[PDB]
Amino acid sequence: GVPFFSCQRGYKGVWRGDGIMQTTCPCGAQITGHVKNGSMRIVGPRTCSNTWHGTFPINAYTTGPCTPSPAPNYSRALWRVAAEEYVEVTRVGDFHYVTGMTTDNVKCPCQVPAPEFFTEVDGVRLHRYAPACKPLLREEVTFLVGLNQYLVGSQLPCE
Amino acid sequence: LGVPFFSCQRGYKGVWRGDGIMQTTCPCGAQITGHVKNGSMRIVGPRTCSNTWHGTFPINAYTTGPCTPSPAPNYSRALWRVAAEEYVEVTRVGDFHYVTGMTTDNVKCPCQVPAPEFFTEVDGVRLHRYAPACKPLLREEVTFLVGLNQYLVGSQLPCE
Ligand SMILES: [Zn+2]
Ligand SMILES: [Zn+2]
């Protein structure tokens, strides 16, 4: 529980649903977000990086009726495809590639979902519950889409 | 205003993934604590809450803690969030699943069901902390989209 250095990188952007969000940063700071017209006003202590940056750290201690609605313009995302398994997705233009996986031969859907179904987008967590991400395997591993296997680095087949 | 028993949300009773202290608020106003160790949750709450008496834990937008439900495979119906604010109802018969309802006509959903823990709601029990309001489910004369193909409501999912 250390100020600034313990701090989770928080979300800043459009939210869906209006009302009050609350969370606790890993430093110990309680952060309040007031969401009105999709836009969040942050209230926090000056002991937390999130207060300075206008951001809201989403995690297992987040409460409130709203959810992030991120822009579809991300570079990388973490996508939870099984109970404790993740795939990393890299976007280039309108195309999406699996550039990493937590375990060899993860089964994933052939199409990326909308950005708010991602557990993380560019290092920012979007989901309240998320299991720990094991080390991402980025070489000589394969993912499954139905009955077809593809080497890491491969575009998702439904494009 | 929250009323003992009448306001109470239907809570989860089952296996939990992760160990630690879970915390939630029932719509009746009760604060429910769950101590989770080795898959099992110990429920603490007031005599005023239907969840305390059933030994259940209501999962909602005011739930906190490091654990998630691991629901049982023998569920009948489930709510599956297939788009940002759209749901499909899934009915399970044997090892086979059917889309028996949808919140909007022509919803695009995946061709395969995920494991039960990825469902928003299983047999009237909410499993996720954040979930959008479910619109009335359309059960007659609607279709869903898997890629380019259309399927009528009641149809089995493509991949099985
Ligand atoms: Zn902080
Ligand atoms: Zn209650």
Swiss-Prot record, chain A:
PTM comment text: Cleaved by host caspases which are probably activated by the viral infection. Ubiquitinated. Ubiquitination by host TRIM22 leads to interruption of viral replication.
Annotated compartments: Host endoplasmic reticulum membrane; Host cytoplasm, Host perinuclear region; Host mitochondrion; Host cytoplasm
Membrane topology of the entry: Peripheral membrane protein
Annotated segments matching region RNA-binding: 1-159
Origin superkingdom: Viruses
Binding site for Zn(2+) 2: C7, C25, C27, C48
Residue ranges, annotated region (Interaction with non-structural protein 4A): 131-135
Function: Phosphorylated protein that is indispensable for viral replication and assembly. Both hypo- and hyperphosphorylated states are required for the viral life cycle. The hyperphosphorylated form of NS5A is an inhibitor of viral replication. Involved in RNA-binding and especially in binding to the viral genome. Zinc is essential for RNA-binding. Participates in the viral particle production as a result of its interaction with the viral mature core protein. Its interaction with host VAPB may target the viral replication complex to vesicles. Down-regulates viral IRES translation initiation.
Notes on the domains: The N-terminus of NS5A acts as membrane anchor. The central part of NS5A contains a variable region called interferon sensitivity determining region (ISDR) and seems to be intrinsically disordered and interacts with NS5B and host EIF2AK2. The C-terminus of NS5A contains a variable region called variable region 3 (V3). ISDR and V3 may be involved in sensitivity and/or resistance to IFN-alpha therapy. The C-terminus contains a nuclear localization signal. The SH3-binding domain is involved in the interaction with host BIN1, GRB2 and Src-family kinases.
Note: Cell culture adaptation of the virus leads to mutations in NS5A, reducing its inhibitory effect on replication.
Subunit comment: Monomer. Homodimer; dimerization is required for RNA-binding. Interacts with the mature core protein. Interacts with host GRB2. Interacts with host BIN1. Interacts with host PIK3R1. Interacts with host SRCAP. Interacts with host FKBP8. Interacts with host VAPB. Interacts with host EIF2AK2/PKR; this interaction leads to disruption of EIF2AK2 dimerization by NS5A and probably allows the virus to evade the innate immune response.
Protein name: Non-structural protein 5A
Source organism (scientific name): Hepatitis C virus genotype 1b (isolate Con1)
Residues of the full protein shown: 2005 to 2163 of 3010
